[PDB]
Ligand binder design. Structure first.
Ligand SMILES: [Cl-]
Ligand SMILES: [Cl-]
Length: 129
């Protein structure tokens, strides 16, 4: 599924991401825009052999099992395919674990390079929330 901006903001709010670990809703919407272009089915292979999955591009080396990443830890205890669903629940639940791991949202390269230190409130402007 490709989400609209406000539709995703509302879904993320319902799943408790607004101000989760101090990160306002706009941060999460901005990260999703630049990680996946709001597409739940996005996948990208990395040089180390791992793959990033879904709306928040969660990586198979640490967080989910895709059956082809040797030495993967599967910390979210889910198949990576579950992260591609139109229902973002699995992605949100896993993201909550990632953001709590010590480095906050810096775990998402696109967030660090394209969202951090910008007016992220713009990403939820105009939305009925
Ligand atoms: Cl915000
Ligand atoms: Cl933090």
């Amino acid at each position: 599924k490709v989400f609209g901006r406000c539709e995703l903001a509302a879904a993320m709010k319902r799943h408790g991401l607004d101000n989760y670990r101090g990160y306002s809703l706009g941060n999460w919407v901005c990260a999703a825009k630049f990680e996946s272009n709001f597409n739940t089915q996005a996948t990208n292979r990395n040089t180390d052999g791992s793959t990033d999955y879904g709306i928040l591009q969660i990586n198979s080396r640490w967080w989910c099992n895709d059956g082809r990443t040797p030495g993967s830890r599967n910390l979210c205890n889910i198949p990576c395919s579950a992260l591609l669903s139109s229902d973002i629940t699995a992605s949100v639940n896993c993201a909550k674990k990632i953001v709590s791991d010590g480095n906050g949202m810096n775990a998402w390269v696109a967030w660090r390079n394209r969202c951090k230190g910008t007016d992220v409130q713009a990403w939820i402007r105009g939305c009925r929330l």
